[PDB]
Ligand binder design. Structure first.
Ligand SMILES: C[S@@+](CC[C@H](N)C(=O)[O-])C[C@H]1O[C@@H](n2cnc3c(N)ncnc32)[C@H](O)[C@@H]1O
Ligand SMILES: C[S@@+](CC[C@H](N)C(=O)[O-])C[C@H]1O[C@@H](n2cnc3c(N)ncnc32)[C@H](O)[C@@H]1O
Ligand SMILES: CC(C)CC(=O)C(=O)O
Ligand SMILES: CC(C)CC(=O)C(=O)O
Ligand SMILES: [Cl-]
Ligand SMILES: [Cl-]
Ligand SMILES: [Zn+2]
Ligand SMILES: [Zn+2]
Lengths: 336, 336
């Protein structure tokens, strides 16, 4: 009893927040794969009869899942068959994003490291990340750690035209056009699924005449930069590093074309990951990001000094670097 | 700058310890699968030339991994080719155990929940947990949250004979015999790999005459309880629930045979998971443990009241329940 009480207090201190985070991440990744997490919100209820039909799940199984997440404190049962997310659900979901990204999205690298160390080329084509999991976990991490800064910076500039390179479902552009009256936008993406999803979301928002979705590569902007002309802001979120070190010349031409294409006073806003930071807050997650990129994906992450030298080499007059809450994430504002 | 500073502070608060834990868990699961984590300790160095040869890894690849974990703050480079774990490595490894257990060991349940909801029997035989990952993550969780209480309780009783049901590599029995002079022990396990590993560890400790390793089932103790006779302490860590609800009668006979077999003043010490607790500290991880057991594995977790009624039904005169730091974990001491 006395020995057990001391071990209890010691063990609680040692475990800290890891049981809570471990549980949240597993429930939310499972729920997201089922399509349930998208219907969970702190300001409205999920009706199980309707959601089970929408997701093609047996309602008794959905109810048992929701009762387990209710017991966990992640949702509140309002009436029979209705559940609301807990008040701080979005922060819990944000935190879970880091765990999902390292442990789920990058799982092929965790499990097959011996293969990548022996024959990288064979391992890289065999052990491939599920890009739906990469995207969702990135979005959850971004919600509170990089997306708000990029959003507010673009809105505060009061732009007439915004171009997003690697726009995906054009969520950022739709929200910028909603806040800046009279603004136009171009959402460039090389995936058919993403451009079709962006098209339906643009139509739903009622801004098809203002927001144009184009299915093409960022690399095609080096030879064909017409879509960038007159842009007040050009945004590129965690995309440029995928062109380095193999497509460096094409990357530099895309950057020089961005500078020359901007309207006076315009800027190119790049969010990207800098390698292996030493400061206490950032170093652990910085090393995970840097190692997965360098060792497993062979994509070159640039320091702030490298990014500034590359951006000034593309003709930009001044470059500002801003620290994001996302560890190792930096926002570079390259002024024409 | 002002907007970015506010988003920085907000984002740091929202992310909290999740980037650090996410990074630690991924590096340590990757390192454990490579066999590197076993050579990491805060009180000694890992020599890369020797460890790379022992693990059959290219030394340059091992060095790059260790330099990434050094950048992360998990290890310290002492000289060239020598690395020591950070001072608090064992607490970090403990916390990582929860993430590994929910996100790695139980990954089949996360990824294939729709299958378990549609055809449980087909899913249960198709989507199977890697039991090496279940064991290692359980051990990391146990290090600071259940193993010390069980260890100290057995040692304080000053037993002449201890039996461990589901002993594995007999780590607990070896440590109890080391602290209690003249004590004997029986390590029962139904796996050949575990019994062979236990045999080599028992021989290494120099206690082959005192510790006997037996390859047989816990269920065989219901018909053949001879090995339990005269035991002062019988230990069963997270094993009894695997016999419920299908082998209930056999479980009850194993428990009644434990009571009748104990020497006077002896006790049966069971550590197990109780279902779906509501208290704030335990509820989230309790729900994850309870849901993986109930929904995915169909194993019956018993409340404290159920465990007490079952143990008193087996003839035990008094039962005490002790809260462990492991959320939802309870230690039941059933006195003869
Ligand atoms: C914003 S990027 C962020 C993740 C990044 N691709 C990575 O893993 O390093 C993801 C989105 O950009 C798109 N995308 C990726 N590479 C692209 C490229 N070179 N040109 C155009 N779109 C691209 C993808 O289709 C997806 O919608
Ligand atoms: C201590 S149990 C804890 C985990 C538990 N099996 C679970 O997943 O619910 C794991 C160890 O007990 C052994 N074991 C499991 N079931 C057993 C049984 N019925 N009889 C004997 N040993 C058993 C395994 O071989 C392993 O070494
Ligand atoms: C750094 C993350 C936001 C996304 C990323 O770059 C990746 O997962 O490859
Ligand atoms: C509760 C854990 C310690 C182990 C367990 O019961 C399992 O993983 O099945
Ligand atoms: Cl000019
Ligand atoms: Cl009696
Ligand atoms: Zn990337
Ligand atoms: Zn279990």
């Amino acid at each position: 009893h006395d020995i057990a009480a001391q071990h209890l207090a010691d063990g609680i201190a040692a475990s800290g927040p890891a049981p809570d985070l471990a549980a949240a991440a597993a429930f939310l990744e499972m729920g997201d794969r089922l399509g349930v997490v998208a219907h969970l919100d702190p300001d409205r209820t999920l009706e199980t009869a309707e959601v089970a039909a929408a997701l093609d799940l047996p309602e008794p199984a959905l109810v048992r899942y929701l009762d387990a997440v209710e017991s966990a404190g992640l949702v509140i049962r309002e009436g029979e068959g209705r559940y609301r997310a807990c008040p701080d659900f979005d922060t819990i979901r944000h935190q879970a994003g880091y765990i999902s990204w390292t442990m789920n999205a990058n799982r092929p690298f965790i499990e097959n490291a011996r293969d990548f160390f022996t024959d990288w080329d064979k391992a890289a084509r065999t052990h491939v990340r599920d890009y739906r999991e990469v995207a969702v976990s990135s979005q959850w991490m971004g919600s509170h750690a990089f997306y708000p800064t990029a959003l507010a910076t673009i809105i505060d500039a009061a732009p007439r035209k915004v171009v997003d390179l690697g726009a995906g479902t054009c969520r950022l552009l739709i929200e910028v056009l909603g806040a800046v009256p009279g603004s136009t936008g171009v959402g460039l993406d090389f995936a058919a699924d993403a451009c079709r999803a962006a098209e339906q979301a643009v139509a739903q928002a009622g801004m098809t005449d203002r927001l144009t979705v184009v299915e093409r590569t960022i690399q095609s902007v080096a030879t064909d930069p017409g879509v960038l002309e007159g842009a007040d802001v050009i945004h590129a979120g965690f995309v440029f590093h995928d062109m380095l070190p193999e497509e460096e010349d094409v990357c530099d031409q895309v950057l020089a074309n961005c500078r020359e294409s901007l309207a006076p006073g315009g800027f190119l806003a790049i969010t990207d990951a800098v390698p292996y930071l030493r400061n206490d807050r950032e170093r652990r997650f910085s090393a995970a990001v840097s190692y997965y990129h360098g060792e497993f994906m062979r994509r070159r992450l640039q320091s702030e000094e490298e990014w500034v030298e590359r951006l000034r080499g593309a003709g930009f007059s001044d470059v500002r670097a801003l620290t994001l809450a996302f560890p190792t994430g930096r926002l570079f504002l390259a002024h024409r």
